[PDB]
Design a protein around this ligand. Sequence first.
Ligand SMILES: [Cl-]
Ligand SMILES: [Cl-]
Ligand SMILES: [Cl-]
Ligand SMILES: [K+]
Ligand SMILES: [Mg+2]
Ligand SMILES: [Mg+2]
Ligand SMILES: [Mg+2]
Ligand SMILES: [Mg+2]
Ligand SMILES: [Mg+2]
Ligand SMILES: [Mg+2]
Ligand SMILES: [Mg+2]
Ligand SMILES: [Mg+2]
Ligand SMILES: [Mg+2]
Ligand SMILES: [Mg+2]
Ligand SMILES: [Mg+2]
Ligand SMILES: [Mg+2]
Ligand SMILES: [Mg+2]
Ligand SMILES: [Mg+2]
Ligand SMILES: [Mg+2]
Ligand SMILES: [Mg+2]
Ligand SMILES: [Mg+2]
Ligand SMILES: [Mg+2]
Ligand code: NA
Ligand code: NA
Ligand code: NA
Ligand code: NA
Ligand code: NA
Ligand code: NA
Ligand code: NA
Ligand code: NA
Ligand code: NA
Ligand code: NA
Ligand code: NA
Ligand code: NA
Ligand code: NA
Ligand code: NA
Lengths: 237, 46, 119, 194
Amino acid sequence: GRRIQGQRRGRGTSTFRAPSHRYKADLEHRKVEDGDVIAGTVVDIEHDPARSAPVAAVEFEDGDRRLILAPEGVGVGDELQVGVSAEIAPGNTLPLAEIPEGVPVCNVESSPGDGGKFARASGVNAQLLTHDRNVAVVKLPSGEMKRLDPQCRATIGVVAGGGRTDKPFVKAGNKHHKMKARGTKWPNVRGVAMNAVDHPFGGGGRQHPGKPKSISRNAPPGRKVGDIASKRTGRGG
Amino acid sequence: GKKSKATKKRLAKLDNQNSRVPAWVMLKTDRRNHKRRHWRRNDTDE
Amino acid sequence: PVYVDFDVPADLEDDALEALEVARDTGAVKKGTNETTKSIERGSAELVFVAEDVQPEEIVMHIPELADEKGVPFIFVEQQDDLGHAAGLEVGSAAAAVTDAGEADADVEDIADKVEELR
Amino acid sequence: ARSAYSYIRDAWENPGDGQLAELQWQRQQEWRNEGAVERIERPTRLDKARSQGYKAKQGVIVARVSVRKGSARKRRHKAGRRSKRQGVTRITRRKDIQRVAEERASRTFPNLRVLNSYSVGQDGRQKWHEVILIDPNHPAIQNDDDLSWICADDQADRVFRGLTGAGRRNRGLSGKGKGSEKTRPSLRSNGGKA
RNA sequence: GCUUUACUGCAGGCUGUCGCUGAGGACUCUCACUCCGGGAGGAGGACACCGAUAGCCGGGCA
RNA sequence: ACUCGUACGGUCACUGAAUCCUGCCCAGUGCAGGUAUCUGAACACCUCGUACAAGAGGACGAAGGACCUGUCAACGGCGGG
RNA sequence: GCACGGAGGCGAAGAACCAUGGAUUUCCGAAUGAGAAUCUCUAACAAUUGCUUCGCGCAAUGAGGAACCCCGAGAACUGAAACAUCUCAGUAUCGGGAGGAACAGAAAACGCAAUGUGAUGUCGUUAGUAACCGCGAGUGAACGCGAUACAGCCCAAACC
Ligand SMILES: [Cl-]
Ligand SMILES: [Cl-]
Ligand SMILES: [Cl-]
Ligand SMILES: [K+]
Ligand SMILES: [Mg+2]
Ligand SMILES: [Mg+2]
Ligand SMILES: [Mg+2]
Ligand SMILES: [Mg+2]
Ligand SMILES: [Mg+2]
Ligand SMILES: [Mg+2]
Ligand SMILES: [Mg+2]
Ligand SMILES: [Mg+2]
Ligand SMILES: [Mg+2]
Ligand SMILES: [Mg+2]
Ligand SMILES: [Mg+2]
Ligand SMILES: [Mg+2]
Ligand SMILES: [Mg+2]
Ligand SMILES: [Mg+2]
Ligand SMILES: [Mg+2]
Ligand SMILES: [Mg+2]
Ligand SMILES: [Mg+2]
Ligand SMILES: [Mg+2]
Ligand code: NA
Ligand code: NA
Ligand code: NA
Ligand code: NA
Ligand code: NA
Ligand code: NA
Ligand code: NA
Ligand code: NA
Ligand code: NA
Ligand code: NA
Ligand code: NA
Ligand code: NA
Ligand code: NA
Ligand code: NA
């Protein structure tokens, strides 16, 4: 047959790429030699095309102007601090170790100094639970317990823009506009609505999957479609 | 369209190659321009 | 480095090269790793020199143990061009051998003893 | 008595033992950071180089080349093929890694000609070889009775035509008797069956 | 052309083994190697990656 | 490539606004988890064989399978008496 | 000039014509200062190399050629009255490269087993033999011999 859509993706052609040239900034924590004396002022609050959430422009004492992952409750004029000695207030960045437990955090680093990887989408947050001279247990938004190096820097507060998911798109047109800002092919044609040659679920006099939808982890690309290595399906039980 | 100096030189040449075999040549050889390109019925390169 | 098992103090190295220079003018000297090797093998070696800035190291790796199973004394030298110049060459030399000193057997003998003591 | 050279050689019979072992464990670290073709002032194996024609002289050059280990990097068939020709994983090239290395070097020095090459070890994913090249245009070589032969026009791009030592063994030209029916005088004149 | 529990194979995935690969049936370490860090240095570590091979799955493809 | 992205994400599928709803079935097929015991290749190892070798056998046993379990908004099924 | 017109001209100062050698030889073109559909913009071996007075100072490479030659990559139709090994075939085609010819070549050979031959190509033969093969269809040498032409040498190391 022909390569399925999932396979056309990987080639990275225009249709599948994200409009990178239209993006603003790669939101990452700053690199401080050490000390914490690094502080800056919020200059403006801008919209981030890549995340559908706000982001804050900040000017640092050392003339550095950079956009930053804005937590909720950060306004123009506010003073933010990034370092080991950072104060413990919303918008400030400092290693998990210096952070008190029970405090919601966002934009958490997986490796000290990697700039932040976890908890960065609209209104999400991580929850620093345990400390130690070795491990810093954090609970990510998915609910998983992640052991982390306490030297990993993070930002206090929940990400801005919370609740974005509460409103329905209502119409195709709205989906369309959002989709246009992401690296994604949209709308979606069902496999069963295709021809045998185009998808493992294609063909037939009527529409229905040909075989069972749960597919093995070992299935090859071109065939791994439907419910990938599902441990269970349905709602029952 | 906008032509370059070179294109213009080539068009000029084609226009020239489009002239007739002079009268005297007919006499000098005791007796056709196989390159008669019409602007409408024919087509030039480029 | 891999064939170097002890460090020769700058001063010692200086005295050693000094001895070598007179050795060429009074007694006899062998310049070049191949010629040094045959000395150690033929026994006609009293003191052999080996540079430490030799690349590749294979060119000399053998000198130590060979000299040790032959009872011949050897000393290390940081530079390679200094050993070559001290031997009287306009070029460098990875190894040199004092084949019968000359008006320096006293120093050589001592330098040998100093190294032995230097372990 | 033994030449000093004999010692370099005797060491390289067991590159995984003794001082040479520790030496390699160190070098490769630097090598894995160098490029694909690095020119070097001195051969890592003097005895071998000299044995193969090397000479501390103007116009004689040496270079270490790195090449990946393993079978052919082959793309699977994109059209009909009988089962016999659908292979990918077990297919190996007919040119050995050493020749690949000799060619990568010669291309790097367009004006030079390959003289010979030898192995200098390998880690788990690549092999290194040192190639000896010659400047057929330098008078220091055009006047050398033991090398000026490589200056002749018909020696141009000799590595690409298999005229190298490794090139000739790989062409199955070692045996002068039985077994070399389809190799000598050339693979191509024998309809490519050797 | 297409399908599948048709025949035969071929990619791919999983898994064992050998090489890279080192010090003291469960374990510590650091020095290769990998990753984070501008760097100092951190994490990981003889595993992973990669090369070779073996068993299983394998209309994704011939 | 996704990705100047990080689960309020994005990938793979099914159904197809709203409203009232969505029963029974895990035997088969699929997927997933577990597994005393059984089965399970090659290297290394042991025995026999061979002044070596081919070869035969043994010990050990990974994934996988048997076996057990979970799962149908998973493929699908919902009869005769 | 082909090219046999009109006008006019050149040649005994030996023209035309032919041979060899030299002068001139625009732009693009490997195309090389940079850019470009044959043009343009502000001193140029661009790029990769060798030597090096370490300065592009001295040099090299690049591209072409009817096929031939050498080194790599490598099908399928077809034949087997289907078809998978096999066959078509190491063919077609593709990548890299040399020369006027390439390649090969002075035995770690042969093995008419010998008290024998004596670098290598090629031609004739050996022979559709030995050998391979769903032992099917098919595939398929060599030594030797008769010829052609003949040619044998240099390093590494020892010792200096
Ligand atoms: Cl969305
Ligand atoms: Cl060459
Ligand atoms: Cl004979
Ligand atoms: K066929
Ligand atoms: Mg980023
Ligand atoms: Mg939704
Ligand atoms: Mg788009
Ligand atoms: Mg749809
Ligand atoms: Mg349809
Ligand atoms: Mg299909
Ligand atoms: Mg339907
Ligand atoms: Mg349906
Ligand atoms: Mg006109
Ligand atoms: Mg020939
Ligand atoms: Mg990296
Ligand atoms: Mg098929
Ligand atoms: Mg130009
Ligand atoms: Mg047939
Ligand atoms: Mg038949
Ligand atoms: Mg054949
Ligand atoms: Mg024979
Ligand atoms: Mg000589
Ligand atoms: Na279908
Ligand atoms: Na026209
Ligand atoms: Na070359
Ligand atoms: Na063959
Ligand atoms: Na059709
Ligand atoms: Na069932
Ligand atoms: Na079931
Ligand atoms: Na001319
Ligand atoms: Na040039
Ligand atoms: Na220059
Ligand atoms: Na037929
Ligand atoms: Na048929
Ligand atoms: Na067959
Ligand atoms: Na006879």
